[PDB]
Amino acid sequence: MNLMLALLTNFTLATLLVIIAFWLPQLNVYSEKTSPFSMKFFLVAITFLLFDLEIALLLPLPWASQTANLNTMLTMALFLIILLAVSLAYEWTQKGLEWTE
Amino acid sequence: MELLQVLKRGLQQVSGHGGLRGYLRVLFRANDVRVGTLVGEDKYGNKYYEDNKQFFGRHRWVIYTTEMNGKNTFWDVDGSMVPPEWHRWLHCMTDDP
Amino acid sequence: MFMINILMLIIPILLAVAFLTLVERKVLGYMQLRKGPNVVGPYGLLQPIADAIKLFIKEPLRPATSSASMFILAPIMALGLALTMWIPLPMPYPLINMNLGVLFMLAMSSLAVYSILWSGWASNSKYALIGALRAVAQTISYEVTLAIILLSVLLMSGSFTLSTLITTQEQMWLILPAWPLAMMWFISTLAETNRAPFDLTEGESELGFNVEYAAGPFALFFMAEYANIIMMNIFTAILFLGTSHNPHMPELYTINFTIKSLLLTMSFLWIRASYPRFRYDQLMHLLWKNFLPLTLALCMWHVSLPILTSGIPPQT
Amino acid sequence: MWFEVLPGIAVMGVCLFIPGMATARIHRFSNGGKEKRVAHYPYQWYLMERDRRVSGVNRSYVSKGLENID
Amino acid sequence: SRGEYVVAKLDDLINWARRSSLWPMTFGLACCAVEMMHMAAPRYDMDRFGVVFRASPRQSDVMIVAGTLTNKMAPALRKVYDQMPEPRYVVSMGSCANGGGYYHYSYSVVRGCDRIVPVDIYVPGCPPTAEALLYGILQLQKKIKREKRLRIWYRR
Amino acid sequence: TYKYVNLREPSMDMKSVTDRAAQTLLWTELIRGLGMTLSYLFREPATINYPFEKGPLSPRFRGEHALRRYPSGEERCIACKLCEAVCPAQAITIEAEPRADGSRRTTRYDIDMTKCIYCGFCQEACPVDAIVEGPNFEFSTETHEELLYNKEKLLNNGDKWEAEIAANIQADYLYR
Amino acid sequence: NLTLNFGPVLRLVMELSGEMVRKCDPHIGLLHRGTEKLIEYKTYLQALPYFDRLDYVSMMCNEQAYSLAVEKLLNIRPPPRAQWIRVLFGEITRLLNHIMAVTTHALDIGAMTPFFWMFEEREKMFEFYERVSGARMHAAYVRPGGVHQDLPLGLMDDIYEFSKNFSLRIDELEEMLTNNRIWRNRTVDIGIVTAEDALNYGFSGVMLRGSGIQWDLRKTQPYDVYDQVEFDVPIGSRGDCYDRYLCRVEEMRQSIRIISQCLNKMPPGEIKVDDAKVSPPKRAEMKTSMESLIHHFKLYTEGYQVPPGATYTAIEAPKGEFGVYLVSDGSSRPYRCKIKAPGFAHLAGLDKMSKGHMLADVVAIIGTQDIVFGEVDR
Ligand SMILES: CCCCCCCCCCCCCCCCCC(=O)OC[C@H](COP(=O)([O-])OCC[N+](C)(C)C)OC(=O)CCCCCCCCCCCCCCCCC
Ligand code: SF4
Ligand code: SF4
Numbered sequence A: 001m002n003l004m005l006a007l008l009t010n011f012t013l014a015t016l017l018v019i020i021a022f023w024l025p026q027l028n029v030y031s032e033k034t035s036p037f038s039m040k041f042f043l044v045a046i047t048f049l050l051f052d053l054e055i056a057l058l059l060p061l062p063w064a065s066q067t068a069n070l071n072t073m074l075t076m077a078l079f080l081i082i083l084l085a086v087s088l089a090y091e092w093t094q095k096g097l098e099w100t101e
Numbered sequence B: 001m002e003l004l005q006v007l008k009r010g011l012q013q014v015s016g017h018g019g020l021r022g023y024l025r026v027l028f029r030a031n032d033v034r035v036g037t038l039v040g041e042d043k044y045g046n047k048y049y050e051d052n053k054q055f056f057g058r059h060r061w062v063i064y065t066t067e068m069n070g071k072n073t074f075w076d077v078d079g080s081m082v083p084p085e086w087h088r089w090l091h092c093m094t095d096d097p
Numbered sequence C: 001m002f003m004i005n006i007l008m009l010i011i012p013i014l015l016a017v018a019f020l021t022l023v024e025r026k027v028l029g030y031m032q033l034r035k036g037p038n039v040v041g042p043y044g045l046l047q048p049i050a051d052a053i054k055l056f057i058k059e060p061l062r063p064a065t066s067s068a069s070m071f072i073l074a075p076i077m078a079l080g081l082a083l084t085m086w087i088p089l090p091m092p093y094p095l096i097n098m099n100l101g102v103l104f105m106l107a108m109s110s111l112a113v114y115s116i117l118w119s120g121w122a123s124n125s126k127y128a129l130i131g132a133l134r135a136v137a138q139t140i141s142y143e144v145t146l147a148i149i150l151l152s153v154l155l156m157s158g159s160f161t162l163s164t165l166i167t168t169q170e171q172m173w174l175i176l177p178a179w180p181l182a183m184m185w186f187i188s189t190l191a192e193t194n195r196a197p198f199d200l201t202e203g204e205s206e207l208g209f210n211v212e213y214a215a216g217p218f219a220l221f222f223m224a225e226y227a228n229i230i231m232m233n234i235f236t237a238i239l240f241l242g243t244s245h246n247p248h249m250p251e252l253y254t255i256n257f258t259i260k261s262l263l264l265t266m267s268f269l270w271i272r273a274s275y276p277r278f279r280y281d282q283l284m285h286l287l288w289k290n291f292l293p294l295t296l297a298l299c300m301w302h303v304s305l306p307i308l309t310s311g312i313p314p315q316t
Numbered sequence D: 001m002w003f004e005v006l007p008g009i010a011v012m013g014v015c016l017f018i019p020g021m022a023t024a025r026i027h028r029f030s031n032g033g034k035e036k037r038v039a040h041y042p043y044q045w046y047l048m049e050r051d052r053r054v055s056g057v058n059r060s061y062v063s064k065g066l067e068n069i070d
Numbered sequence E: 001s002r003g004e005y006v007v008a009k010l011d012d013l014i015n016w017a018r019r020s021s022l023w024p025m026t027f028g029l030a031c032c033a034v035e036m037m038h039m040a041a042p043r044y045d046m047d048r049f050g051v052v053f054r055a056s057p058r059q060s061d062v063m064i065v066a067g068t069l070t071n072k073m074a075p076a077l078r079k080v081y082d083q084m085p086e087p088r089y090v091v092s093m094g095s096c097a098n099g100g101g102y103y104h105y106s107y108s109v110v111r112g113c114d115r116i117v118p119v120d121i122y123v124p125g126c127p128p129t130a131e132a133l134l135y136g137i138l139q140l141q142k143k144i145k146r147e148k149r150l151r152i153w154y155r156r
Numbered sequence F: 001t002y003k004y005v006n007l008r009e010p011s012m013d014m015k016s017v018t019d020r021a022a023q024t025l026l027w028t029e030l031i032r033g034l035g036m037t038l039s040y041l042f043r044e045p046a047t048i049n050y051p052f053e054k055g056p057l058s059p060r061f062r063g064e065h066a067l068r069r070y071p072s073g074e075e076r077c078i079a080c081k082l083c084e085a086v087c088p089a090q091a092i093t094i095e096a097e098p099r100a101d102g103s104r105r106t107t108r109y110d111i112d113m114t115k116c117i118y119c120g121f122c123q124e125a126c127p128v129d130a131i132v133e134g135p136n137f138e139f140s141t142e143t144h145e146e147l148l149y150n151k152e153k154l155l156n157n158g159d160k161w162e163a164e165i166a167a168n169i170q171a172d173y174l175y176r
Numbered sequence G: 001n002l003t004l005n006f007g008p009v010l011r012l013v014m015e016l017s018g019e020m021v022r023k024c025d026p027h028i029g030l031l032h033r034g035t036e037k038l039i040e041y042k043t044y045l046q047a048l049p050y051f052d053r054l055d056y057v058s059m060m061c062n063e064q065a066y067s068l069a070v071e072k073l074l075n076i077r078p079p080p081r082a083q084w085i086r087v088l089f090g091e092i093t094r095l096l097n098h099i100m101a102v103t104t105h106a107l108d109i110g111a112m113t114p115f116f117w118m119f120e121e122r123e124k125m126f127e128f129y130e131r132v133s134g135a136r137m138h139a140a141y142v143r144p145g146g147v148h149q150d151l152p153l154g155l156m157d158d159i160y161e162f163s164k165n166f167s168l169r170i171d172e173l174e175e176m177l178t179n180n181r182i183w184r185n186r187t188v189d190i191g192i193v194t195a196e197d198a199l200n201y202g203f204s205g206v207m208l209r210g211s212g213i214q215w216d217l218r219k220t221q222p223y224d225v226y227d228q229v230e231f232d233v234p235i236g237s238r239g240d241c242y243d244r245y246l247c248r249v250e251e252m253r254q255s256i257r258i259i260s261q262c263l264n265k266m267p268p269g270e271i272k273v274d275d276a277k278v279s280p281p282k283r284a285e286m287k288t289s290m291e292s293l294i295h296h297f298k299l300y301t302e303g304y305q306v307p308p309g310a311t312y313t314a315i316e317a318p319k320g321e322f323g324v325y326l327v328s329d330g331s332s333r334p335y336r337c338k339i340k341a342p343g344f345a346h347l348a349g350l351d352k353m354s355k356g357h358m359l360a361d362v363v364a365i366i367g368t369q370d371i372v373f374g375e376v377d378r
């Protein structure tokens, strides 16, 4: 219940400031004023997604070090990170990480 | 030791303005509580001070009068309230008050 | 009493953000051989209050936005999330004692990109959208290193609990065994919060995304942005500059911990005054070609180092 | 001078001290002068709920010692 | 308490906030922009009054026209003025902006910026000293201090 | 003679190459820049406390035009129109006629302080030290019409600033 | 390609293919005031203040170029003391321009702090202007025949105290920029100009010297007493923004070297040509002598007549080669006065220099050319 109140208070407070911000100066009456897809940007987002997913597989590492099979665990932990570095090398050499046309 | 002397000068500014009340008066009007040698006063009440240890540009200042020509100038000071005779000394066009 | 606790956390945060604007303007002034605000109140102590009132009684624009509902959602989300990232911070006792607090802060921090993206749409300007896309690509790129670096540090701590980082540093700061990670964590926090030398948004002559906002709505984006600057520097001190906790005198922790959190916040202002600005293609290369190769290599080193020394931390 | 920057730091410093000082005091006020119990794992929660039943008063922080044993 | 007393004090609170946080948008068109930079320089340090060095057009309360306004530039000036959120003030700096100055009789110069936008303060000189523009800014502060928006609304 | 600014060949020995590796990895020259800004944080700022302190000026300063008198009270101007001829901005307008006592005196003397470029040629051309630029530089107005001076406004300025104008001219007329 | 009319005193019309700048189209004229047409309704003295307002960062070097041109058509010579004064303040003006050029070049790309340190030095140099002429910026102190007035007593001592400390100010500026890796990345191999394209595009000044061309009018076609002082001309090797930044920083040091010689070799004498049909007499002798009153009357109403003829006269102004094609018809007012601003040709090469560079580099390239639109548009 505590975490629920904390979220309710923060967003309720933010909404109040926003609406009274759009209305408090409107208590004033000012005269009415009257009167390309980029490919490289997309590749940054996709590269982040595939890297972000691989991070999801690495988050449980601290708990994985508590096992009695450290030899197996340490072998796969270094395999995931090595594979993550192989993806970076492939993009680097294939001109993926460039911003020049 | 030199840390101590800094605090002593900080206290002697309170006594050099006439206690706390005078010290606060020049902190809110002028935003500065330095103490200088009085050079003179003009007929409108402005008081002029000098301190030659200060770097060129801060070595002369004027504490404006609180009333001039029937206008309340306690808060509404203005740089054109300096009469011509003192306008020449305050702007360092001469060394003679 | 919990409701009183929430208000004892929110209001002081906003007041701290209010007077951070003053301190920033005066530290920058003295590094530039000038003073900064010293007229509005003694030593400019009333300057923050004058600025707040002025913005909230100034007429807002609200242009012909394509939605007019994202234009109001963006500042709510930014400020709402900025205050939410404080609730698990041990100072030294959290408001909410989460078991996975370190993971909670990553999760909430990755949602702050929407307010940047939504405000881009709402502006209805094609150019303002380009500025939003560059800012978004910057934020997601540099939170790759935040996640991996954090994982590397927690391998010497053993949990995602934020208060366990206090126990871990009960004999020595983690800055000593992990200073290379601290360097790339500190710079990664500047890029996340669009701070110089990484402020292309506010870096005129190349672009910002929050350009159509004025008055109160603009201040809401500003307040959220500065509350994140304090929060990230509080996170850094807990992570790399652990403060000893005495259960009988908890105030002793708070004073020491606050001084560290201030010194790291002033370092942000110090760095703004000293360096020129990165180019967009150059801060991306600083991440994908320099930080990431080292972060990945150090992650391998920190997974293996505890094993080969027999220094794996306890799970609990 | 540079020391005229400090007063702004003191106000900013004090505002970052209240949240830490307030939480520590409120916990002790609401937990009978002790730290708030930390229950991250099911075993700790089981003990805390058991303490609630042993207190007589439905409060986890009222501890019963040997004087409660015959 | 009387209604005429609350409005008088509320007028002083809004005036105090507005004149203590003037954020200027500087139109640096010609030599007069150089003197405006010396007002931001350490000698005078406009920032210590609350006057920020640079502000965007939509976050700004005052427009400073510093230089010669040409006929090819006038439409851009009016557009920026119309997009300034209110309240908004214009300071005319220098002879060129006040009345055309040295180029008054030119075919490509607008004779004074006050026939394109309204002007609150005129700062004379060619260029005005950085201490003369600062005097003008502090004269705009006192003008805002005399505003009585609430005391006139209460008597409608 | 000439010198090269950027024509050095960096050494390729191991110690030199390692020196640049430490600089690249440990950010040595960036932290050298932080120290310089730290030094300025402890230097006394150059700000003056305007309006209670003023920036230094000199007797030659060129400010607000003004019309002077002889020590008897008679006007110095004799409507020669040299200042009107030399003014590069054509900011001066003059009309004259015989006075009741027969003197050559102006009936109009206007300066448009928005055409004026504050150049000082009017006071160089004057043969009798009548039109001068004074030391006042704080005379900004709230309307455009207050900056169109006529002979009454200019004579009031001269009487108002004569004490300071005379002392400045005393201090500089030996260079003219 | 995406097109942006960035607009506002520069309006840039660029087409961008993503991050690259495929074409740059500068639209100028937002500060055209018809200066060259107004000079035709003025006497030669009345047109002197116009030149202070063309390149308003280097005021006293625009007077010198105009004064050299008129003195050439008049066939007269300024006196030796005036020439030494005109070099002393030519180099002080060159410190004023390079501080503005370098520090506003660095402020537009993020580094805001060096601007405030060095504008305290500009303020002090504005006092040297104000103590000789009475005006901080538009002195109108250099004139055909010499200088208006002589130096006040004690000014040369104050110039010495300022120059004694300036070299330290430059060093602090170089501690922030020269070796900073962020600054180098923004300026190295950006806007590369070949030594042959620079000549054919009309470049002058550090736009030539940055590409290795050994050219400086102060040494090859000297004027006043620049052939009696010692200084070195910085030369670049790669012809980019970084090399040009080093040439201006090193030219600030060579100005302090020239100033140290002007203060020591300043001769006595008069400060304007002793011919009262060109330069006005002294006020003391204008009030006692009949000829001196006649010549004062005519010089300030009609002006001195200049013999018929045309001349192109140029100097090594801080921003490059500044000159005027002054044409005379034998009367008191010039017939035609064309002004050659170095930034007019430099800004016409922006399109060439920004090929294959990012949008954020166009900011740096405009900075390295040191453009002031008072002279570009006139
Ligand atoms: C026994 C086993 C030991 C195993 C571990 C051994 C570790 C040995 C040391 C490894 C190197 C250490 C890593 C350092 C990080 C290097 C990152 C990097 O990419 O460098 C190159 C990068 C860029 O390198 P570059 O731009 O010069 O060139 C890269 C390569 N080429 C030339 C090909 C392009 O440097 C930067 O990160 C730029 C910095 C940006 C500006 C940052 C401002 C700094 C302000 C001071 C902050 C001080 C830190 C405060 C910390 C406070 C924490 C509380
Ligand atoms: S008023 Fe004078 S200084 Fe200002 S732009 Fe015009 S000519 Fe230049
Ligand atoms: S200062 Fe120059 S422009 Fe102004 S009135 Fe005198 S002569 Fe004319």
Ligand code: SF4
Pocket: F076, F077, F078, F079, F080, F081, F082, F083, F084, F094, F122, F125, F126, F127, F128, F129, F130, F131
């Ligand atoms: S030059 Fe002097 S005397 Fe002649 S008209 Fe002008 S002010 Fe009068």
